[PDB]
Design an enzyme around this catalytic site. Sequence first.
Site, PDB file in Angstrom:
ATOM      1  N   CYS A 296       6.105  31.977  -9.508  1.00 12.02           N
ATOM      2  CA  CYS A 296       5.590  33.245  -9.005  1.00 12.02           C
ATOM      3  C   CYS A 296       6.466  34.424  -9.433  1.00 12.02           C
ATOM      4  O   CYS A 296       5.966  35.505  -9.715  1.00 12.02           O
ATOM      5  CB  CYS A 296       5.527  33.195  -7.479  1.00 12.02           C
ATOM      6  N   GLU A 393      -0.683  37.836 -14.868  1.00 12.04           N
ATOM      7  CA  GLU A 393       0.205  36.705 -14.661  1.00 12.04           C
ATOM      8  C   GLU A 393      -0.265  35.566 -15.563  1.00 12.04           C
ATOM      9  O   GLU A 393      -1.403  35.110 -15.456  1.00 12.04           O
ATOM     10  CB  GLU A 393       0.184  36.271 -13.194  1.00 12.04           C
TER      11      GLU A 393
HETATM   12  C1  LIG Z   1      10.570  30.170  -5.862  1.00 13.35           C
HETATM   13  C2  LIG Z   1      11.435  29.015  -6.358  1.00 13.35           C
HETATM   14  C3  LIG Z   1      10.783  27.674  -6.037  1.00 13.35           C
HETATM   15  C4  LIG Z   1      11.728  29.178  -7.848  1.00 13.35           C
HETATM   16  C5  LIG Z   1      12.335  27.929  -8.486  1.00 13.35           C
HETATM   17  N1  LIG Z   1      13.550  28.242  -9.243  1.00 13.35           N
HETATM   18  C6  LIG Z   1      14.757  27.625  -9.138  1.00 13.35           C
HETATM   19  C7  LIG Z   1      15.071  26.487  -8.187  1.00 13.35           C
HETATM   20  N2  LIG Z   1      14.566  26.790  -6.853  1.00 13.35           N
HETATM   21  C8  LIG Z   1      14.105  25.634  -6.072  1.00 13.35           C
HETATM   22  C9  LIG Z   1      14.998  25.392  -4.858  1.00 13.35           C
HETATM   23  C10 LIG Z   1      15.072  26.730  -4.146  1.00 13.35           C
HETATM   24  C11 LIG Z   1      15.544  26.590  -2.719  1.00 13.35           C
HETATM   25  N3  LIG Z   1      16.829  26.768  -2.408  1.00 13.35           N
HETATM   26  O1  LIG Z   1      14.724  26.320  -1.859  1.00 13.35           O
HETATM   27  C12 LIG Z   1      15.989  27.595  -4.990  1.00 13.35           C
HETATM   28  C13 LIG Z   1      15.162  27.972  -6.216  1.00 13.35           C
HETATM   29  N4  LIG Z   1      15.671  28.166 -10.000  1.00 13.35           N
HETATM   30  C14 LIG Z   1      15.042  29.144 -10.675  1.00 13.35           C
HETATM   31  C15 LIG Z   1      13.674  29.181 -10.180  1.00 13.35           C
HETATM   32  C16 LIG Z   1      12.711  30.163 -10.730  1.00 13.35           C
HETATM   33  O2  LIG Z   1      11.528  30.228 -10.337  1.00 13.35           O
HETATM   34  N5  LIG Z   1      13.206  31.024 -11.734  1.00 13.35           N
HETATM   35  C17 LIG Z   1      12.310  32.022 -12.326  1.00 13.35           C
HETATM   36  C18 LIG Z   1      14.559  30.932 -12.167  1.00 13.35           C
HETATM   37  O3  LIG Z   1      14.956  31.716 -13.055  1.00 13.35           O
HETATM   38  N6  LIG Z   1      15.472  29.981 -11.625  1.00 13.35           N
HETATM   39  C19 LIG Z   1      16.855  29.926 -12.107  1.00 13.35           C
END
Ligand SMILES: CC(C)CCn1c(CN2CCC(C(N)=O)CC2)nc2c1c(=O)n(C)c(=O)n2C
Lengths: 494, 494, 494, 494
Positions: A296, A393
Amino acid sequence: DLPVLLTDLKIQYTKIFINNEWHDSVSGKKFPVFNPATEEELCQVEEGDKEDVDKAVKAARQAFQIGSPWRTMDASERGRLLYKLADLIERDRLLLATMESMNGGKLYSNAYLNDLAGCIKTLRYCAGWADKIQGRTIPIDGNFFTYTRHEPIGVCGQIIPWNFPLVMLIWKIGPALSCGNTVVVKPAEQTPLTALHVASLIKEAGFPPGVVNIVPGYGPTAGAAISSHMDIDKVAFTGSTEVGKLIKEAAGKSNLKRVTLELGGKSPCIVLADADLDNAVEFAHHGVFYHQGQCCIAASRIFVEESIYDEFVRRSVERAKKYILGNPLTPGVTQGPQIDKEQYDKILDLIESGKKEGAKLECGGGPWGNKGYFVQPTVFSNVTDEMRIAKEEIFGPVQQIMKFKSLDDVIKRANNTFYGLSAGVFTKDIDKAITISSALQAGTVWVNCYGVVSAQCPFGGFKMSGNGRELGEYGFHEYTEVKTVTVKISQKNS
Amino acid sequence: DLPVLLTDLKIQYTKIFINNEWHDSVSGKKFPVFNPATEEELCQVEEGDKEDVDKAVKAARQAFQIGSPWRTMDASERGRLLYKLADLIERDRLLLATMESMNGGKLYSNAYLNDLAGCIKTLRYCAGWADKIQGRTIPIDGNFFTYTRHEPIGVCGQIIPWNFPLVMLIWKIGPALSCGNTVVVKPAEQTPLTALHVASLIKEAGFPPGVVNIVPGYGPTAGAAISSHMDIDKVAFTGSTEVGKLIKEAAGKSNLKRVTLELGGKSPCIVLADADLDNAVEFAHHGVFYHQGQCCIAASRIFVEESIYDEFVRRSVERAKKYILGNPLTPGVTQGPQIDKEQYDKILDLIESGKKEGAKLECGGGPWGNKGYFVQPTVFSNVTDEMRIAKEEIFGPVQQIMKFKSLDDVIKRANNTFYGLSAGVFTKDIDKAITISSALQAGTVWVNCYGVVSAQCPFGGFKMSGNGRELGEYGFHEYTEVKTVTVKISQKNS
Amino acid sequence: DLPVLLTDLKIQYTKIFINNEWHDSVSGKKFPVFNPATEEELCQVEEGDKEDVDKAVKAARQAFQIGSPWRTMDASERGRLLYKLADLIERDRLLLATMESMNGGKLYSNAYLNDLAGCIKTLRYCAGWADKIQGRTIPIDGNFFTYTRHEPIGVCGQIIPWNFPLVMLIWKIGPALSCGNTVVVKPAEQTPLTALHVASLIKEAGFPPGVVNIVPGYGPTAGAAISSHMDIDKVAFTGSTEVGKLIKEAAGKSNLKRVTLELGGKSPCIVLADADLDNAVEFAHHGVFYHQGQCCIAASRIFVEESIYDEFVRRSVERAKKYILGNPLTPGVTQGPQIDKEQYDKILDLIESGKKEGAKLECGGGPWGNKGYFVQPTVFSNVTDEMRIAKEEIFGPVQQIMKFKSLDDVIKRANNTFYGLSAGVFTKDIDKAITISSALQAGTVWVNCYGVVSAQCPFGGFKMSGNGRELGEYGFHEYTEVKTVTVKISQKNS
Amino acid sequence: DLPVLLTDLKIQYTKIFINNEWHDSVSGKKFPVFNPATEEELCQVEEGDKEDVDKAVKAARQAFQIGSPWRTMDASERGRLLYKLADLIERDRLLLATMESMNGGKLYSNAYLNDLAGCIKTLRYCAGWADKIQGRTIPIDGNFFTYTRHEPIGVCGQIIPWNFPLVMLIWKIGPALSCGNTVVVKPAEQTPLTALHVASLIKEAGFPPGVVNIVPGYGPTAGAAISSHMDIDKVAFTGSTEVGKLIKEAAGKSNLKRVTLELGGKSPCIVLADADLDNAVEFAHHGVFYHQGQCCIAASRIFVEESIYDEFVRRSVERAKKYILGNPLTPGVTQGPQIDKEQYDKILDLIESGKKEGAKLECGGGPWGNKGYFVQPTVFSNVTDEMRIAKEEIFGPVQQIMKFKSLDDVIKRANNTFYGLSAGVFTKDIDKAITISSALQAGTVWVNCYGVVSAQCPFGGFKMSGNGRELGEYGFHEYTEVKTVTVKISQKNS
Ligand SMILES: CC(C)CCn1c(CN2CCC(C(N)=O)CC2)nc2c1c(=O)n(C)c(=O)n2C
Ligand SMILES: CC(C)CCn1c(CN2CCC(C(N)=O)CC2)nc2c1c(=O)n(C)c(=O)n2C
Ligand SMILES: [Cl-]
Ligand SMILES: [Cl-]
Ligand SMILES: [Cl-]
Ligand SMILES: [Cl-]
Ligand SMILES: [Cl-]
Ligand SMILES: [Cl-]
Ligand SMILES: [Cl-]
Ligand SMILES: [Cl-]
Ligand SMILES: [Yb+3]
Ligand SMILES: [Yb+3]
Ligand SMILES: [Yb+3]
Ligand SMILES: [Yb+3]
Ligand SMILES: [Yb+3]
Ligand SMILES: [Yb+3]
Ligand SMILES: [Yb+3]
Ligand SMILES: [Yb+3]
């Protein structure tokens, strides 16, 4: 350190979960679940419909009744159950990551190291809020004692997307349960499997029956039944802005249920001439390419000051040309497939508009392989604001890079969209970091980084990227209903 | 002490208010405003439509732009403006109460002593929050500095009801302005006059142009234009549940604007055998009869334990038979008219269903006078849960009294409604007061009182009586949009 | 004379029919089809959805293209194909009636002697119109030659009900094909089987591929896909008034496709004191009890002049008490089951309102058997106009009998409904027969009979019982689109 | 021969017309009516709303009751009334044409010679059908006598456009009244005046009260009230496709009222190399430029075979450069204004897309004068199918000219639109005239002419240009409701 499962994965849980028992669909029907990297059917799952959403809601309503175990247990015990559930997911980390990777087309290293770590950490975070949700005592005018209760709302319908099935399941049920709600969850049709495994762990952890019910099925049938249901108090949804508008309309027409939405984005980055160029290149890259662009918050419009634009483009294309496409379960593979054909089609369609409307194609621009929904990582430079690839998007591995010379202008261009989920600002100047991030109409603004998401801070969109916030202290407000109690007294004293 | 205006009221402000100037309607049309106690036309007012709502929104949007006076002034100065506006309303208290009483059919003693006092007090309350709206700094995982800004949302469309025109105008603009929003207000077609006077005071107080715009007109035209407008960030509405559903649907179809609703009620009281009987009789009476029954929180279902039911009914009928109907401007008059014919018709219709469906009519039950929309105060005993007068909001001087013998049962009966705005509990027992008020699905529960509303505490409905809360610390959350800013740093320290 | 099938029925055709070939669903899913007399699953059928409705429409569109075989063949040859199809259905009469009886819960004697005879006769009727559809030459003002073409409309979506699956399939495809349209048919989810057999005969008869496509599936999925499809020129639907309103809205929102609807009824009979009493009793009886009350034209309100009311009721109850309930395939059985649980529930619900609201129960009033959806034939006397059983279509074996004394009044009562499909008048007086039938707001009025339906005359509703007419010369107009061609000439002569 | 009014026009009838009397609006409000050539207010007219549409419908319903004068009078007498009304309009021809010209911005020569002649002729045509509307006697199977009545439908709501106010009023009321319906007419907000004068003549002619009611007002208020009204049996509307979809949806949601729509067009002409070039140029010219382009049937896409394209363009531009813009009441003036600002804006907007998207501007392309809504006659050559001016109805003096080389291709291009009101074919070859006109998906096809419309032939659209037909023998079917009467007899004989 990346451990793997030392046995082939067996698919075990494939039924509807209501009152901590497994149910066949009322219709009798099942639906297929596929592996997007091979197009092979993985298993069949019971298909929930209106008729089954009703069994789930009646169960959720019963578990929410005054005097029930979930309503009467200590808040600290709700917290305990949530911590226990996190420990169980930690125990099954290898199998859940594999299942996630195989079902959702997600790189196993990311599934194991990021998705599963984030699920566990976010659940543990939510567990700690349970007995720290507090109301107020209020010095009202007149001779009265007034206090507020932050009660649970009630039965919450929660619709989970396919891009981060387990993470988003936990973002939904974590806060909802911590606050004392009961839930009816509809995982994505593409990715029901990890949710059903978690359901087995919810039963093992000892949640009272009816507190979590999981009904796999289709959006137009099971998702519509949730959004229009007359005894569901609130609906949470993450997905496209398009479906988000239908959810909000259905709530309106039915029972005025509360609605929170986390929807799409067309998130911009602004890279100033004084930025650390390599750092900006790397974060903007990961920002758009993470999980095959299926985020997103994808950094899908990158505005770079004219004097460093060429060098930014060169370094960006260089980074994009280093990927290795393949099945996400094999080590060394660094790009898995898109989730399915609809998404695949939309992405290829949008890549064509780019070429056609006259953006400069720097690499990629076509499919890959004989099996799977693979798109080559694609970079476009000299993109302009009117092009389809700057307005829509994509939700695919497709990076747009644009030049700017005037800061006032580029902020207006950044803001010139109905979206507003997130944004990035890259600069070494204090004043610019503070003033630019204040001026951006985006829910999260990163400065000199991108995609940094954690359980401790609230997450959500401005404008048509969503309503409400998730996680942090804030997200917990969206899962309570405030009751004011005012008691007549003979005389008040401060 | 009840002072009065020592000159006939002259009607001065009758035009659309945009950018602190008076505008004729784009169409050129005007509409009549009537006095409900005489059915006489008081004046004509400019009729706003889609075309005029657009001029108001463009103005509100301009006044909200980054770098504008309203965005850049100190929060404490927003507070100062609000305090100044309250002082001005205090200065014009006599004329505003008279205008309110004459236009809205509201008893002058109540208009002067309650409505105007509540407006002034609530504005002063809101003014004090302006520079105390704060975000957070958050100990996120990883090497980052993360903080939140509680920004204003933007342009807020606010639709004011006819029952408490001035009070509700201030409940809307107070919080919205304190938080730094700009507003487009559509007062009720019946009662635009006091809003337009306040607009003159907003200009006098020194609010920047475009921060408050007031567009009188009709719901189906001006109200629909607000709810469906593409550049309005949020809509607030107080009125019927029926229109509330249309508002929420229109927001969904258009731009996913945020929505808060304060809607109808069918609010219950539960009177236990141990209650102070006279106190319960008096509060329940005022609870349903206040302002001719035209309150969202009307105590329109009164459940009284069997053993004190007869005595409660007797004392209630006795109190209801003491009213003096007439023009609300004359001292000694204690019941003014209904607001208009539609309401008048609906009320008389509903009174007939009572008689017909077989409730015991204790007094009243017909109209009064040769001019005005007057209904005799009406009391029904032996009402049962299936009757129209127990299910439908009457919004008129019509009291329903019912018996109960079992507490479990009567709580289920109290809760057995799609409404959920408020409730009352009358008892001397601590445990019963706490446990009953916890079990009632209502936004405000009064114990041993009724209708106690103050700026310090949040106010709003469960279920179909509304979404969100107004006033208190809480209400201010509905007028902010949270932005998370996350900054990469080399090393964090706790 | 009632011959039967001398072998157990084998179910052969269970797939989607597009371009004269059998297709699996795009999803891969199937759905169960049950026998309502045993609740046993008979087979599984391929489940069509939006995605499959699109393959059917593209095929229908292709077969409709200028220069195609269906567009260029002689109209007399379209007629020939239709006659051939009728001969084939006559050949398979035994198997189709058995399939109809087993799948639809329909008495085999009726299925064989009435349904199959009506299908064959109606097809033969339609076949004869094919080369007799004519336009006009018109004496327009000015020097022009003007003529009209009655062209086919194009691709017609046709949604068939479950009560008369084969008959209604032929009422739809007969006229549509005779006029030269192509069709996409969605049989009822309950009763897809006979349609798929007919499809096999359409292929055998030699219809060009794409002229008839049959897509079994669900209303909310396949039916909605038809009604909202952008390249479907017209939709025909028979079913409830409730779904009819959704169909008409969907056409509006999408592509303004033409719409014809045959919807429910609450059809009245008026029995005058001078009527042949036994004849009126018998026709009114069959009128309401035919096919378990599952007829749109059910005589569900019978008004009988006071002086013969008692005797009418007695004779009616006497006739109703002669039924033999059981599986519709066994000789001597005279009442089969209701179609399914939803209908069964609605009927039992409505029978309860009768008893409760205080109608006199003369016989029946409960279910029957341990298997099947059987309702006892039920008669109510002293029914009044406000009761649920006088306002709502029951669609079950439930007869309402009412008295009247004034003719003016009873006509107003007959007409006092949103329905208007049919009515019956029983009298020996010429003037009364003509004047009463003129005054009734009903599409078909029978005099001294009931339920007489034939291919030669038009059939359809006034008011909310439908839009348009089927069959007769009239019905054929609803399946043409008129084009006017005006040619400039030097000089016209009469 | 063009006579003129020898006195200044005085505006006399400005009120709502119900039961042959003049009514003020229930609200009390009025609205302005302007002269589009001067932007000057001509008068004020009473503004009808829901509340007034209800008085009109109750009146129409009463005049439609069995036994009323309109229901019981001879059909020949309905015809007589219509002939009398035409004679009266002929008597007031000078004043009606002037009123039409002044209110609607219509050239007085056209208003007098075309509009008024067409009104009178069409009314006289309709009058002759009244006693020639016949049903059928039908040789049904079995011993029955079956006949049909072509009854009036009932209360018909009719919404008249602003482009041809008087003509369209008569196209609506003529057939409706001839068939025996009663009507509630809502003339356009821009052009209510001629309708109200005709109403005075309806009273003079002797129509029973309630048979014609005329309610001036706004689309969103009065027009919406008609389309959603529960006791209106049918709605007819001429206007944009956009509003047409809302009308059809409103009918669906409310009472399933019958709906006929005559909507926009993007009508093509195909000019073959063998055509009489001057004749094709002249008819195509008038085809697009008639009444300032404000015709549903505007020839707004002209496809000319390559070898004569240049010469066609030259001759076309030559003809377009001969106009004289000014007030439509002055002799010699040959182009009046557009109707109003919205239309004016839309037209100028669309002319800009032409220039911008790269069509060749041959003449015009801007506004004209200091007063009025005047657009210069505009011609574009080398237009292509993707341009906005080839896809969107302009409804202004703007001609699109395009080349083709392949006949198969240009027919597909002609047909490649959601519109389908009309088309033109210019050729000397018999086979091409017949085959091309058969292949065009258009309701009226002219051969070697354009815009030839007469009362004797049916008029209406394919596809989204409308549902149903007006005028001719055909149009009269849309204003009847067919009732089948089937009478049991002892024995039938052929
Ligand atoms: C909205 C989410 C699910 C995005 C996922 N994501 C993660 C890992 N993600 C999962 C665990 C999440 C938590 N702590 O619940 C912390 C974030 N890393 C990211 C991204 C990302 O969408 N984009 C664009 C990125 O650039 N990076 C580095
Ligand atoms: C929702 C509100 C407007 C109700 C009005 N009200 C007041 C006076 N009111 C105005 C100023 C308000 C403020 N401080 O803004 C404080 C409350 N008194 C009441 C009521 C009432 O509705 N009912 C049922 C009652 O019984 N009583 C006693
Ligand atoms: Cl593929
Ligand atoms: Cl593929
Ligand atoms: Cl009155
Ligand atoms: Cl009155
Ligand atoms: Cl059952
Ligand atoms: Cl059963
Ligand atoms: Cl202008
Ligand atoms: Cl102008
Ligand atoms: Yb799909
Ligand atoms: Yb493939
Ligand atoms: Yb009104
Ligand atoms: Yb009155
Ligand atoms: Yb079902
Ligand atoms: Yb059963
Ligand atoms: Yb306008
Ligand atoms: Yb101008």
